[PDB]
Each structure stands twice: as C-alpha cells, then as structure tokens.
Amino acid sequence: CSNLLLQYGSFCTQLNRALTGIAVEQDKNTQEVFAQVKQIYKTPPIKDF
Amino acid sequence: SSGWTAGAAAYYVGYLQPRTFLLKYNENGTITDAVDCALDPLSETKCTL
C-alpha cells in the first residue's frame, strides 16, 4: 500500500506543510500574546500598594 | 595446477534490497545525485520534504 501511495507524495507533502504551518502559527500566537515585554520584572518583596 | 600467476584485478559484490530513493535529473537528462531514503534521519527528512 505504501508503494501504491508513493504517487500521492505531492498530496501528502501539501497536508504536512499545512499542518506545520498551523503549528508554527499557534506558537506565534502564544508568543505575540504573552511576550509583549522582554523584561521579566519581579514583584517587590513588600506589599504596600 | 601450479604454473599460473594470478591476475591484478579486484571486484566487489553488493546485495540489492527493496528501498525507496530520490533521484535528480539534470537539464541534459542524466541522473547526477540521489538520496537513500531510510538511511539516516537527515535523508529521511530530505525524502519526506
């Protein structure tokens, strides 16, 4: 069946490319939402607000 | 059975097995390079892509 499927490598490459694009897009979404600032501030030890 | 000198030649024998390959046909129609799919991970990636 794999030997018969070899002639559909274009289709399967297209599918894998689409899914890879989706995955990279998800990583990009998370980064652009949360990593707005690249200075990791830490809260002061004392709580006087 | 004793009065004979050997030649000065060498040969090599391999063994074909069922394997999937990638081949590159140049502008003149000759094969110039190939990839042994299922040899190492890098060739596997070249073969999948």
Ligand SMILES: *[C@@H]1O[C@H](CO)[C@@H](O)[C@H](O)[C@H]1NC(C)=O
């Ligand atoms: C293809 O054939 C022509 C004439 O034989 C030659 O000039 C040319 O170099 C060949 N192509 C390459 C990449 O060598």
